[PDB]
Amino acid sequence: LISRIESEMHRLQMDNVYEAGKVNLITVVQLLNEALKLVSGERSLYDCKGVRLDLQYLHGKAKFESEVLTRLRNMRHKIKREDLVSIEKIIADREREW
Amino acid sequence: RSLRQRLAQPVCQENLPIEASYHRFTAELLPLAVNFIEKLEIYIKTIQTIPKI
Amino acid sequence: KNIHITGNRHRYLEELQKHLAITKSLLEEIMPSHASENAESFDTIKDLENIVLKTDEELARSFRQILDLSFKVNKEISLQSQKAVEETCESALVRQWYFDGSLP
Amino acid sequence: ELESIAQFTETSENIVDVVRERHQSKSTLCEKMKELRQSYEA
């Protein structure tokens, strides 16, 4: 934005940002008005449409990963209440009859 | 006592004549404009990564 | 508070208006038809990442328990196999394998 | 919008690195799960 202003200046008259110890809001809005004229310029080279992020795909995968994360937790907790408790009991009841 | 002490203050030429509904947006636009002018060299990299999407 | 202001407050608004009449006009040069959908996705992206970063932990919790399940299943079968040999061979001969080498 | 497009690129590349480490960090999960499988298939 300095590399902008230094060679806009002799067409873009602008006053100072800090004047009598107070901030000049008109100068801040004039700065924003050539900062935004980078953003529109870069869109005219790299975003020549307005690209959309698909919120329904994003929420759809977020939901489905939450369901993967839940299926993994269900399998992993079933192993740790039904299966291993069946196994470790039958093992210990074999050993204590032996 | 407070109501009279506000009515007893003549229309303040050191204030801005603006309806109270707009006071938030008017005050926050200075911080928002500063933050946008400072983020400017980040946003230009974001626009140069839009082609990745 | 501490804004630089020149003369009458209406005359300052008149000049600020001539520059906000460029800032709105530049958001009209910059806002795509999907700016809101993009701006709303912000935290749905981070919750997807938060779920996926916990799916890595949970895959890594799950397989480290399936290895325990396998090891435990195999002890259940090996103890069942051992018991069948010890009840098809003579209990005096099985006793001579396991205990007569150790008996006071 | 530009905060969310930045976040989308960062998150998309983070997820493409995390799943890569889950495949390639060590044996790997993708190796040891097939070693375990082929024991019970045998």
Automatic annotation (TrEMBL), chain A:
<protein>
    <submittedName>
        <fullName>HAUS augmin like complex subunit 6 L homeolog</fullName>
    </submittedName>
</protein>
From TrEMBL, chain B:
<protein>
    <submittedName>
        <fullName>HAUS augmin like complex subunit 2 L homeolog</fullName>
    </submittedName>
</protein>
Automatic annotation (TrEMBL), chain D:
<protein>
    <submittedName>
        <fullName>HAUS augmin like complex subunit 7 S homeolog</fullName>
    </submittedName>
</protein>
